[PDB]
Amino acid sequence: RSKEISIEVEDIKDAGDTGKRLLKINTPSGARNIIIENEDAKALINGETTNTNKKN
Amino acid sequence: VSFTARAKSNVMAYRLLAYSQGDDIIEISHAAENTIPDYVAVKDVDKGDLTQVNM
């Protein structure tokens, strides 16, 4: 009868929507895409800014 | 029912056992710590000795 019963993210009944997205994410870039909504701030944190991002 | 097991490494009576596989015949050894065992030894079984598992 198995040994571990590896649950999945959606089995965690009091996890939040952003919380489940973060738990599923594999890389730091993916996490930043979830967490940072302001596109200019995200661009700064990614070290990749256009002239429009810089002005903003 | 029962089936043939090939032991694996010095099985002791009353100890918790776990199955594996190798060449063919299911191999039996003592179950690893902190898990769910598969069978209980009823008698001592030598490393490469064939025996039965009484299901």
UniProtKB/Swiss-Prot annotation, chain A:
Q: Which domain of life is it from?
A: Viruses
Transmembrane segments annotated in the record for this chain: none
Q: Where in or outside the cell?
A: Virion
How it assembles, according to the record, is: Homotrimer. Forms a super helix coiled coil in the homotrimer.
Summary of the function given for this chain in its UniProt record: Protein that forms the 55 capsid fibers. These fibers are not always present and may have been lost in some lab strains. They may enhance the attachment of the virions onto the host cell wall.
Please give the family membership noted in the entry: Belongs to the phi29likevirus major capsid fiber protein family.
Q: What is this protein called?
A: Capsid fiber protein
Location of this fragment in the whole protein: 114 to 169 of 280
